[PDB]
């Protein structure tokens, strides 16, 4: 008996059906948590290839015909690869080497977006910014950003206080090392009673050799102090020791007195 046959209309694929995961390394890498990145139809044999390329993601079968998507679950970026730069958000691992650019057979590893807005880098950078590995740009920006730490929760705030105690202990031993001169400077720019108090504590803890070399404006000689009583203005306004001093090594009292010298219109000294 005859049958009324009819073929369906020709298929018209959408953008999703034409997606190829092997072309989307720059689409998948910036993906965030709770975000589905559709990658199109994926054959069964290419599932391990995709899952090993993106271990931080879960491969989800979203629709028929093998339609799949990737959902970021975590960030596996390590401190030495994420903390010593502010511009690299991810990197690729292949044959034991680390590269900024993608290559077939590599494994994606991504950094937390807030890795420098929290204290997740304080431990690694506390050691890296000492000694020969000191990078002036990265380390100054690290210390400076800690003062305006965007993580204002009780945890980001507490990690900030833990870092201050470590820097206070370290810089009390020697405040001349570059990371400590930067910490003293940023305390000065913060301009609070706590930061000023920590400055005086660190500088007063220094050795006699440090004070004789850098803090002669704070500790004048007998003849210098006795002569300064003959003038009405503060000693810091005329003392050559204070005009040649490193402002990061001045006690808070001396630093405040430097801005009380009555500058005549123009240059007043």
């Amino acid at each position, epitope marked *: 008996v005859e049958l009324p046959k009819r073929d369906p209309p020709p298929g018209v694929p959408t953008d999703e059906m034409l997606l190829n995961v092997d072309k989307m390394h720059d689409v998948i890498a910036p993906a965030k948590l709770l975000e589905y990145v559709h990658i199109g139809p994926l054959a069964k044999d290419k599932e391990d290839k995709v899952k090993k390329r993106y271990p931080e993601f879960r491969l989800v079968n979203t629709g028929p015909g093998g339609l799949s998507a990737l959902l970021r679950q975590s960030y596996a970026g390590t401190a030495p690869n994420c903390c010593r730069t502010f511009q690299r958000t991810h990197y690729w691992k292949k044959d034991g080497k680390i590269s900024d650019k993608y290559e077939e057979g590599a494994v994606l590893e991504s950094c937390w977006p807030d890795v420098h807005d929290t204290g997740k880098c304080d431990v690694d950078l506390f050691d890296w910014c000492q000694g020969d590995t000191f990078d002036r740009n990265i380390c100054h920006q690290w210390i400076g950003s800690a003062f305006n730490r965007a993580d204002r929760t009780v945890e980001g705030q507490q990690s900030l206080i833990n870092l201050y105690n470590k820097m206070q202990t370290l810089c009390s031993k020697d405040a001349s090392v570059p990371i400590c001169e930067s910490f003293l400077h940023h305390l000065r720019a913060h301009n609070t009673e706590d930061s000023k108090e920590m400055i005086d504590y660190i500088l007063r803890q220094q050795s006699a050799d440090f004070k004789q070399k850098y803090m002669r404006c704070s500790y004048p000689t*007998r003849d210098k*102090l*006795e002569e300064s009583l*003959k003038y*009405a203005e*503060p*000693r810091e306004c005329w003392d050559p020791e204070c005009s040649n001093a490193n402002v990061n090594f001045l006690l808070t009292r001396n630093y405040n007195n430097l801005g009380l010298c009555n500058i005549v219109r123009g240059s007043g000294l």
Partner: nanobody, 119 residues
Framework: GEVQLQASGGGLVQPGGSLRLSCAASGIVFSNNRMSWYRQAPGKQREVVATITSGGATDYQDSVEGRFTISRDMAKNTVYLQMNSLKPEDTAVYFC????????????WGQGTQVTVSS
């Protein structure tokens, strides 16, 4: 005559204690002078310990920096010297001193008070 700079507040205290010295000036206005606390150990020249300008800026001797603090009260016209963490080498006679801003000849010295620290 009648330029009085009497110092008080001294005494005897074990090393580690504290003293607050006073100097209520008369015949002299602080908004016009620089006040300075001196001290003189037995058989030794006088040395300045702390000072304060007519504007209020302070300065200290290095061996007392952080331990001593010099303040002023413009209303009471009295200059103070808070002494903390007194070390045995602080034993001396502490006295007031007033020096005009630009009138150098008008300098005045005060009557000291005894500060002694020992066991």
């Amino acid at each position: 005559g009648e330029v009085q700079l009497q110092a008080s507040g001294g005494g005897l205290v074990q090393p580690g204690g504290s003293l607050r010295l006073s100097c209520a000036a008369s015949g002299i206005v602080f908004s016009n002078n620089r006040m300075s606390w001196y001290r003189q150990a037995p058989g030794k020249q006088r040395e300045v310990v702390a000072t304060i300008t007519s504007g209020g800026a302070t300065d200290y001797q290095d061996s007392v920096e952080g331990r001593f603090t010099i303040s002023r009260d413009m209303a009471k016209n009295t200059v103070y010297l808070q002494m903390n963490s007194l070390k045995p080498e602080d034993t001396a006679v502490y006295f007031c001193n007033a020096r005009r801003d630009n009138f150098a000849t008008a300098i005045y010295w005060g009557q000291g008070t005894q500060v002694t620290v020992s066991s």
